[PDB]
Design a protein around this ligand. Structure first.
Ligand SMILES: Nc1ncnc2c1ncn2[C@@H]1O[C@H](COP(=O)(O)OP(=O)(O)OP(=O)(O)O)[C@@H](O)[C@H]1O
Ligand SMILES: [Mg+2]
Ligand SMILES: [Mg+2]
Ligand SMILES: [Mg+2]
Ligand SMILES: [Mg+2]
Ligand SMILES: [Mg+2]
Ligand SMILES: [Mg+2]
Ligand SMILES: [Mg+2]
Ligand SMILES: [Mg+2]
Lengths: 80, 408, 223
RNA sequence: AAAUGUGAAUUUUAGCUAAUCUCAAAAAAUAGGAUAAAAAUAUACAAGGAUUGUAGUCUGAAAUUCGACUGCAUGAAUAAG
C-alpha cells in the first residue's frame, strides 16, 4: 500500500498484464428458447406456415420426391 | 564367418510429369448419368441482383463457365461433377454483394470488402458469383485463385532495382495468359492510350490492347507488361473503360511474413511482393481505381494460417458497423500483431457468411432431388432435418450429409 | 383455387397433427404428433442404418479401427460408380438373376455394388479332412456357405486385385477410385476375380463324389 | 506467468502440499494443402535414420572405460521377409 501511494511512478503507462490467469467462458441456455406464452404464438405461426408451403406445392404438383423422379426416368425408357 | 540365414537379393509405363498433380486438380462440371432438372433457368445478365431470385437455383451460361474455368474459379473440393449443368443458389448474401458491385461500377466508386465465415460456408463460391456478375456485365475480372502460391515460396521471384519490392515473373506470365482468355471479349473493345517505352516489343498508341498482352511471351518481361496493362485499364478519362474486379482468395496468406528469403536470409514480408503490394494498395484505398469497381478478399479455413492482425481488424470493423461504443483492441502484451496488416484493413468492409435460411435450403435440396442425387421426399420435415445436421444451414456441411453419403 | 389454412389440410390431404397445427392430447393419447407405424423399417435402427452389403463391405476396407476413413472411401466409391457410364454386360458372365438392367445401376450405386459382389461371390467352399485321401493327402469336400461368407470372400478378392495394381494419380481419391474401377470391371465381366470364382467352382465339381467317400464314413468303424 | 536461447535449457519464483494450485499439452481422427517416371534406362539414386565427426545442455565429487537429451554434418542395410 505504501508503494502504491508513492507518487514517484504511477505505472499508468504499463497496461495491466493478465497472462498469468486463464479466463473461463461459461455457456448458458438460450433465453430465446424458453417456452413462454409469447413464443407459443411464434411457433404456431411457423408450424402453420410450414403446412401452407407444402400444401401449395402438393396442389400444384411441385413437391419434389427424388425416389419417384429416378424411378419414372428409368421406366420411361429415357436412359437408353 | 556368419552362418545365419539371409534372404538373398531379388512393370508398367509410369505417368508423365504433371500427370499426377493434374489428376487431383482436374474439375469435372457435368455428369451424363444425372438427370436434367426441369424448369432450370439460366442466369441473365441481371439475375444475381434481383431480390426475388433469393432461394432459387439457376444455371451458369456456357461462355461464363469457359471464363470461370480459365481463371480457375472452380476448385476440386467443390461438388460440381455430381450434376449435369453447373448451377448456383442465388443467396441473400449474393444479392447484397451484387447490388453494391452494380452501384459501384455505375457511380464510378470502388467497394473494398472482405468475406469471412466458417470452414465451408460459401466464401470461395461467393466470389465465383461476383466474377459471374462481372463477366456477364462486361467488367474486367482479375482473379488470383490461390494466395498461398504467392507466399509459400513455390514460384520464381526476383528483386526490383532500387526498391524493397520483389517480382514473381513465372506467376505474372501465367496470370496474363489466363487474363486474356477470360476477358477476351472486353479487351477486344479497348485500345492503348499511353506510350509505353520499355516493353518486349514496340507498341504504338491507339493499338489493340489485346496485342499489348501478347508481348509477354517470356517470364522476364512479364511484370513490365502487367504494369503497363494496369495503367491502361485505369485510364483516368477514357470512354469505354469498364470497372475492374480485383479479387483474391485466401486473404490470410498475404497478411503475414512470407516464406521467401532475401540475400541476407531474412523473411520477406508478403506486402513487399510487387503483385501482393498491388492488391493490398487497392484494398486499402491507397491506389484508386478511376473507373471504379470492387476489390474483394475472401478468407479461407482449409490450409490457412492465423494472423491476429487480420482477425482483430475484421473484429473491429464489425464492431464499428454494429455501433458498439467499445471496439476490440490489441492485446497490450501480444507480439503476434503486424502494423502494416492493420493499416490495410483499416477501412475495408466485412461480409460474414453463415448458414443459409430454411427457405434457401429447400431450393438447394429440390435441385439435388430433381437431379436424382437425393432420393427423398423434399418437404419441411426433410428440409429441417438437413438444415439441422448441417449446423444451422452451413451449405458445405449440407452437401456431406446429402450428396457424399453412403446411404444412396 | 387459392389455398388457405382453413382448407389447406382438407385440400392437400396433409395431416395437421403431423405438422403440429392441431396437435393431439398428450394427457389422453400419450403422443402429440402421431405415433410411428410399427414395425419400423430396418433402416431406422441406428445400428442398421446402412445397407447390409454396404455396411459389410465398408468394414472390410477398415484398418486399425479407422471406420470414418473407410466410410468416406465407400462414399467415394458410390460417387464414382454414380458418375461412370452404364456398364456393358458380357453374356459370358451372367450376373445374378433378377438384377436390374445395366441402365439402372449408375443412378443406384448401392445396387451397382450389390449386383457386383453377389455376382462374383462363390456358392461353395472347400474343406479338407486331414489324412483321408491316401498317402498323407487330404480329402477335399465342397460345402455351401451363407450370404455373409459369400460376400466376404467376393469383396476380399476385389481388394486383393486392387492392392496389387500400380498407383495412378494423387489426392484422397486414389484408393477409392481404384476400387470403384474394379467394381465396374466385375460387372462388365472383364475382371480377374471371375477366374478365381470359376477356379473354386471346378474343385467343387471335380470333388462332388467325395461327399460319400469310404474314408469319410469309415473313421473308426474298421477295428 | 514473464524474460533469454535455433534447441536441449537457463534466469526468477506466483500458487499448491492439492476435486482448490502445478505437472498439463491428448494423439489418432475430422477438414484442407504440398510433393511423383516418389529406387530397377545412372544427367531422374525413393523412403529410411544405423554408423561416425563436431559444438553444447542437464544430473552428479566424478560422464574416460561407462549416462540421458540438443544443434550441425555424416547418410549404412532395408523391395514386406
Ligand atoms: N451458393 C451455392 N450454391 C451451391 N453450392 C454452394 C453454394 N455455396 C457454397 N456451395 C458449396 O458449398 C461447399 C463449400 O463452398 P466453398 O468452397 O465456397 O466454401 P469456403 O468458405 O470457400 O471454404 P474454405 O474456408 O475451406 O476455403 C462447396 O461444395 C460449394 O459448392
Ligand atoms: Mg475458400
Ligand atoms: Mg487427410
Ligand atoms: Mg513457462
Ligand atoms: Mg508429463
Ligand atoms: Mg515406389
Ligand atoms: Mg532421403
Ligand atoms: Mg560418454
Ligand atoms: Mg514379418
Amino acid at each position: 500500500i505504501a508503494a502504491a501511494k508513492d507518487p514517484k511512478d504511477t505505472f499508468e503507462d504499463i497496461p495491466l498484464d493478465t497472462r498469468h490467469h486463464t479466463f473461463t467462458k461459461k455457456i448458458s441456455f438460450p433465453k430465446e428458447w424458453l417456452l413462454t406464452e409469447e413464443r407459443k404464438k411464434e411457433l404456431e405461426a411457423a408450424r402453420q406456415q410450414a403446412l401452407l408451403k407444402d400444401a401449395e406445392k402438393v396442389v400444384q404438383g411441385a413437391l419434389v420426391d427424388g425416389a419417384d423422379v429416378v424411378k419414372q426416368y428409368l421406366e420411361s425408357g429415357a436412359a437408353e | 564367418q556368419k552362418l545365419r540365414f539371409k534372404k538373398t537379393k531379388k512393370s508398367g509405363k509410369p505417368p508423365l510429369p504433371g500427370e499426377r498433380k493434374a489428376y487431383r486438380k482436374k474439375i469435372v462440371l457435368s455428369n451424363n448419368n444425372a438427370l436434367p432438372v426441369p424448369g432450370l433457368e439460366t442466369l441473365r445478365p441481371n439475375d444475381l441482383a434481383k431480390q426475388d431470385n433469393v432461394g432459387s437455383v439457376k444455371a451458369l451460361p456456357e461462355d461464363v463457365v469457359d471464363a470461370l474455368r480459365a481463371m480457375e474459379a472452380f476448385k476440386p473440393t467443390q461438388c460440381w461433377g455430381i450434376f449435369r449443368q453447373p448451377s448456383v443458389l442465388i443467396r441473400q448474401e449474393t444479392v447484397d454483394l451484387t447490388k453494391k458491385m452494380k452501384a459501384a461500377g455505375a457511380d464510378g466508386k470502388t467497394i473494398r470488402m472482405v468475406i469471412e465465415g466458417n470452414r465451408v460456408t460459401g466464401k470461395s463460391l461467393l466470389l465465383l458469383q461476383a466474377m459471374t456478375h462481372a463477366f456477364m456485365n462486361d467488367w474486367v475480372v482479375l482473379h488470383i485463385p490461390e494466395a498461398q502460391e504467392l507466399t509459400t515460396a513455390v514460384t520464381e521471384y526476383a528483386p526490383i532495382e532500387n526498391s524493397p519490392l520483389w517480382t514473381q515473373p513465372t506467376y505474372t506470365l501465367k496470370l496474363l495468359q489466363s487474363f486474356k482468355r477470360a476477358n477476351e471479349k472486353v479487351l477486344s473493345r479497348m485500345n492503348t492510350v499511353y506510350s509505353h517505352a520499355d516493353l518486349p516489343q514496340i507498341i504504338p498508341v491507339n493499338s489493340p490492347l489485346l496485342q499489348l498482352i501478347n508481348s509477354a511471351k517470356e517470364a522476364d518481361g512479364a511484370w513490365t507488361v502487367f504494369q503497363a496493362l494496369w495503367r491502361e485499364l485505369n485510364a483516368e478519362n477514357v470512354p469505354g473503360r469498364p470497372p475492374i474486379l480485383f479479387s483474391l482468395d485466401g486473404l490470410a496468406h498475404i497478411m503475414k511474413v512470407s516464406d521467401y528469403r532475401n540475400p541476407a536470409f531474412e523473411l520477406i514480408h508478403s506486402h513487399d511482393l510487387a503483385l501482393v503490394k498491388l492488391f493490398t494498395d487497392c484494398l486499402s484505398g491507397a491506389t484508386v481505381m478511376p473507373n471504379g469497381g470492387a476489390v474483394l478478399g475472401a478468407t479461407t479455413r482449409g490450409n490457412s494460417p492465423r494472423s491476429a492482425s487480420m482477425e482483430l481488424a475484421i473484429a473491429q470493423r464489425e464492431a464499428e458497423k454494429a455501433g458498439e461504443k467499445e471496439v476490440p483492441q490489441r492485446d497490450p502484451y501480444s507480439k503476434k500483431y503486424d502494423d502494416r496488416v492493420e493499416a490495410v484493413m483499416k477501412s475495408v468492409e466485412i461480409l460474414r457468411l453463415k448458414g443459409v435460411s430454411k427457405t434457401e435450403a429447400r431450393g438447394l435440396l429440390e435441385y439435388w432431388a430433381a437431379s436424382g442425387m437425393l432420393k427423398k421426399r423434399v418437404d419441411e420435415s426433410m428440409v429441417s432435418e438437413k438444415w439441422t445436421l448441417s449446423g444451422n444451414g452451413v451449405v458445405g456441411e449440407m452437401e456431406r450429409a446429402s450428396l457424399l453419403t453412403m446411404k444412396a | 383455387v387459392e389455398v388457405t389454412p382453413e382448407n389447406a389440410a382438407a385440400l392437400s390431404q396433409l395431416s395437421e397433427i403431423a405438422y403440429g397445427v392441431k396437435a393431439a392430447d398428450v394427457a389422453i393419447e400419450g403422443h402429440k404428433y402421431g405415433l410411428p407405424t410399427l414395425p419400423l423399417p430396418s433402416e431406422l435402427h441406428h445400428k442398421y442404418r446402412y445397407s447390409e452389403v454396404v455396411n459389410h463391405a465398408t468394414k472390410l476396407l477398415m484398418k486399425d479401427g479407422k471406420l470414418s476413413k473407410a466410410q468416406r472411401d465407400m462414399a467415394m466409391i458410390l460417387n464414382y460408380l454414380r458418375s461412370s457410364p452404364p456398364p456393358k454386360l458380357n453374356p459370358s458372365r451372367p450376373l445374378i438373376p433378377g438384377h436390374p438392367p445395366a441402365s439402372h445401376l449408375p443412378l443406384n450405386p448401392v445396387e451397382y455394388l450389390t449386383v457386383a459382389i453377389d455376382s462374383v461371390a462363390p456358392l461353395i467352399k472347400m474343406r479338407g479332412y486331414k489324412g483321408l485321401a491316401g498317402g498323407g493327402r487330404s480329402l477335399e469336400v465342397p460345402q455351401p456357405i451363407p450370404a455373409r461368407q459369400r460376400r466376404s470372400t467376393a469383396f476380399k478378392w476385389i481388394l486383393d486385385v486392387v492392392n496389387k495394381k500400380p498407383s495412378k494419380g494423387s489426392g484422397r481419391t486414389m484408393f477409392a477410385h481404384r476400387v470403384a474401377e474394379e467394381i465396374v470391371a466385375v460387372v462388365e465381366g472383364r475382371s480377374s476375380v471371375w477366374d478365381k470364382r470359376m477356379l473354386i467352382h471346378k474343385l467343387g465339381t471335380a470333388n462332388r463324389a467325395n461327399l460319400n467317400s469310404p474314408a469319410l464314413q469309415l473313421k473308426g468303424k474298421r477295428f
